[PDB]
Every structure is written in C-alpha cells, then in structure tokens.
Design a protein around this ligand. Sequence first.
Ligand SMILES: [Zn+2]
Ligand SMILES: [Zn+2]
Ligand SMILES: [Zn+2]
Ligand SMILES: [Zn+2]
Ligand SMILES: [Zn+2]
Ligand SMILES: [Zn+2]
Ligand SMILES: [Zn+2]
Ligand SMILES: [Zn+2]
Ligand SMILES: [Zn+2]
Ligand SMILES: [Zn+2]
Ligand SMILES: [Zn+2]
Ligand SMILES: [Zn+2]
Ligand SMILES: [Zn+2]
Ligand SMILES: [Zn+2]
Ligand SMILES: [Zn+2]
Ligand SMILES: [Zn+2]
Ligand SMILES: [Zn+2]
Ligand SMILES: [Zn+2]
Ligand SMILES: [Zn+2]
Lengths: 259, 259
Amino acid sequence: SHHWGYGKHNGPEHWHKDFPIAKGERQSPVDIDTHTAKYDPSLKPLSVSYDQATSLRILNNGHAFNVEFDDSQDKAVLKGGPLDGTYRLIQFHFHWGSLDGQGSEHTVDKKKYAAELHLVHWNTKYGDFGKAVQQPDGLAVLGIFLKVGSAKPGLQKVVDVLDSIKTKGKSADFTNFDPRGLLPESLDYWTYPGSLTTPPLLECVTWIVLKEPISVSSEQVLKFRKLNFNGEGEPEELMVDNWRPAQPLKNRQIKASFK
Amino acid sequence: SHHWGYGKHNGPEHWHKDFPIAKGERQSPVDIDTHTAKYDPSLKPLSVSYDQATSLRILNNGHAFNVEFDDSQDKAVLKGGPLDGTYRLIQFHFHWGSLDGQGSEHTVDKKKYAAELHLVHWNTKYGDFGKAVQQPDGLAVLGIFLKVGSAKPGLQKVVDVLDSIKTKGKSADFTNFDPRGLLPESLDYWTYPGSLTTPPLLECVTWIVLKEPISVSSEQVLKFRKLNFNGEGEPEELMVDNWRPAQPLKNRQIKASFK
Ligand SMILES: [Zn+2]
Ligand SMILES: [Zn+2]
Ligand SMILES: [Zn+2]
Ligand SMILES: [Zn+2]
Ligand SMILES: [Zn+2]
Ligand SMILES: [Zn+2]
Ligand SMILES: [Zn+2]
Ligand SMILES: [Zn+2]
Ligand SMILES: [Zn+2]
Ligand SMILES: [Zn+2]
Ligand SMILES: [Zn+2]
Ligand SMILES: [Zn+2]
Ligand SMILES: [Zn+2]
Ligand SMILES: [Zn+2]
Ligand SMILES: [Zn+2]
Ligand SMILES: [Zn+2]
Ligand SMILES: [Zn+2]
Ligand SMILES: [Zn+2]
Ligand SMILES: [Zn+2]
C-alpha cells in the first residue's frame, strides 16, 4: 500500500487510485495487432546514432534498473522515423517476468516475450528532460523484445554488474557501454502516440517498437530475477514481473514502417 | 543541485527556486523575541498524553532521522494549549549543527542552541496525515531546544541505535521508546501559526516551542554528527547543519503561555 509497485496491493490494477490518467485516451503499452497496424509509406527511415554514446552509471531505483547516459550534447541521438526533432538518449531499462513466457509490456498479436528493453530519449526542442515530459511529443522511447535463445554479447557487461546493485538505492559507475550491442539486426518498426508505462503515466511518449526481437540466454535472464525491489535490511521482494499489461488502444492508429 | 538539501548548492538560501512558498506569509522558523512575545491568559494549559506512546522504527531519510509511532489510535496525543482538537504523534526528529554554538531552527532573542527536537502531530479531524497537511490547522509541532550540558537518559536508546542507520535509506525496528524521556521539567511555551521548515514548506503547522531547553552531553551530540546525508557507496557527506535559519515574522503574533 505504501507507494506504487507490482505486488497484489500496489500493482497496475490499482494505479488508477492516485493516477486518474491511468484510464486516459493515450495509455501504454498496447497490443500490436499486425492485421490492423497497416504500412505507412509517408514514414521516413529511422536514424539511430549511438556511436558516441557515453554511459555514466547503473542504478536500482526499486522499480527496475537504469543505465544512464550523458545527455549534455548530441552524442546518442534518435532522428527521422515519426519524429520531428532530435531526441537525446538519457537512460535505458528493462521490464521482465518470473517465467520465460512473460515479461514484456507490449505484445504482438497477443504474444508476450520474456522481457522488453526501453531506450528513453527526450526532444531537445524543450531544453531538458523535466520540461519535455510536460509536452505530448517530449519523449521518444525505443522498445525492443527479448526472447530466450542464445546469449547477447552486448548484454553481458550489464549482467556482470547486476550483483553490485542487488537492492533498491544501490548504484555503480558504468562507463564505456555501447547501447548498439542491444539492437537487433533490423530496425523495421511500429509507431503510435502513447504514455509512460509507470507512474506518473504521463501521455508524452512517441512509441517506436521494433519488429525484430533480440535473443538472450536463460543464464542472462536468471540474473535479472535475482534483483530486489526492496532496500538492504528490508524483507526480500524479488524484482520480477515488473510490467504493465496491455491497455485499450481507443482512437489511435499504429503505423508500420514496413511491408 | 540534484534535489534539495543543506549544502552550498541546494541549501535553504536556494529553496525559493522550486518552492515559491519559501517567501510566503507564514514561514517557519522564526526568532522569538521575548520583549514582543506577550503573555496570553486566554491560552488553556497544554495536555501532553504520551503514556501509551507506541514507537515502531527509526530511519534515515537523507535529511534527518525519524522515530515513527503508531498513529492508528489516540495513544500519544496533544491537546489544549492553542489547539482545537486531538493531535496524534506520528514521528519525531532533530535538527543540529556542526558546532555546539549552532543547530537550532528557532531562536530566542537571537540565541541559537546546539540542536532542536520536533515532535510532529496531526489533527484527527482530517482522518490521516496526508489530508491534514493540506489544511492550515492540520499539524501541531512541539519544538524543544537542546543545550550541551549533562547527558539525557531518555535520549541514550536513540543514540545507541544511530550506528545501525548511518547512511540514507537505512532503518531499524525501534520499539518500547518513551518520548517522555525527552521532555523538559516545564511545559511553559510560545505559540504561533507557521510552516514546515523543510520542503514542501507547507503553511499548515501550529508551532509550540518550549521555553525550557533539555540538556544533552557532548558525547551524545557527537553521535548525531557521524550520520550521513548520503547513501551507502556514495561519497561521504556528514549530516550536520541540517537547519533552516529564522524567517520574517510578518503580520503574526507569538503568544506566550506564561508570565
Ligand atoms: Zn487485484
Ligand atoms: Zn479502483
Ligand atoms: Zn488480428
Ligand atoms: Zn552509428
Ligand atoms: Zn518508487
Ligand atoms: Zn519502461
Ligand atoms: Zn565513480
Ligand atoms: Zn544475423
Ligand atoms: Zn525492412
Ligand atoms: Zn550494506
Ligand atoms: Zn548562497
Ligand atoms: Zn533566487
Ligand atoms: Zn527584544
Ligand atoms: Zn502521561
Ligand atoms: Zn529527499
Ligand atoms: Zn523539523
Ligand atoms: Zn522488525
Ligand atoms: Zn530538576
Ligand atoms: Zn509555568
């Protein structure tokens, strides 16, 4: 009851109590039905420029873990696609499950994936992250599905450091990470106007969800599930099933960048 | 810069940036000038009923440390004085300095004390703490000055447990504490309508500041100054000088319960 989370008492089901936007017109995530999400030839190609991405630190905030980036220049930026502007990378994080058969927030024809990677960018138009989240086109989030298969070499440096931030509030220096190690072979995508998938659930996100999932080993996802929602000294609550289920699409169109 | 505190960058001096109420009509603390704070015979005597006070836990929130109480019944209550209602004890905490010559928030004829004890109560009229802080008579805070002299036996159990919550976010079970061990010989007091002395600086507090200070040993206050503002693993910032200086009294009267 204390403040929001993913348990029986404080979960997605109950977020409408302190956040009436939870039942709003533009909520995320959604289910991407491939028969309705039609192709849009007006969509320009997406330009992911991460070659100068400068990571700083990894931390556990009690809700997931974030790798944070220097956002002071156009070092890691997101351009074109459905975006009018330059969007700087500020952090990324994951949502995952207690079983391989669940963990993703978005779904494709009702299929759930073992996890989902969210790379979070803010529109430089507004000046900083804080001002951007108060505008409907302030954020662009790039969402990537994880399936249990073979190991992702780009993910291993993250996994190695997870013991050092087991409990809420812990953090660590995490430099020279290259977020390109987490991208799939193709950048074909769906896009729709949405929201943050956690409180305050603000409807300020242009979603870009990649068609092609990345593969991670079962050994690597097991490492995610040893994390803790709780602080050190408090009772153990395993950080698992930290995902919001799909929401009503309502009067929105999911445009597709592909065939 | 990150979020508020007591350093050069984030201190009381700069709180007006995110909190315009900091320059409001009813801000606390104030200096109690004894020549103007006249006696009011209409003030009923103060009734401090702490015999059934049930403490639960002690924690470091990064700004000070709080001992928290069961507020579910009328076990520890504050009545009469300038209060119209029953006020339940929810927590207490301290503000102290880096030197014995400072640490208090309130002052008496410009004199500063080594520390100050704040016992925090909410009006049962409103139902819970959260609803109370949004009303001008929602909170009653009982403020007590500490001077460096001989040891306070009632304070020693708090001091013993301080090693176990050195850094921000740590907490511990803290049961069978009796807050009566921190009261002075006399309950003669000054009262005025004010605010929280930390953000969000809400103007919802009826202040009751006791005339008579309590004595604590230098050994006991040294133990306060080993605490840390920071979390575990972060760079060391000693939790000292965590006090707001005196504010303009403006169109307010400080009533005195005594001679
Ligand atoms: Zn339920
Ligand atoms: Zn409901
Ligand atoms: Zn379909
Ligand atoms: Zn590149
Ligand atoms: Zn939280
Ligand atoms: Zn996310
Ligand atoms: Zn470092
Ligand atoms: Zn290939
Ligand atoms: Zn393609
Ligand atoms: Zn530790
Ligand atoms: Zn200054
Ligand atoms: Zn200023
Ligand atoms: Zn005077
Ligand atoms: Zn009593
Ligand atoms: Zn804080
Ligand atoms: Zn205080
Ligand atoms: Zn316990
Ligand atoms: Zn005596
Ligand atoms: Zn008296």
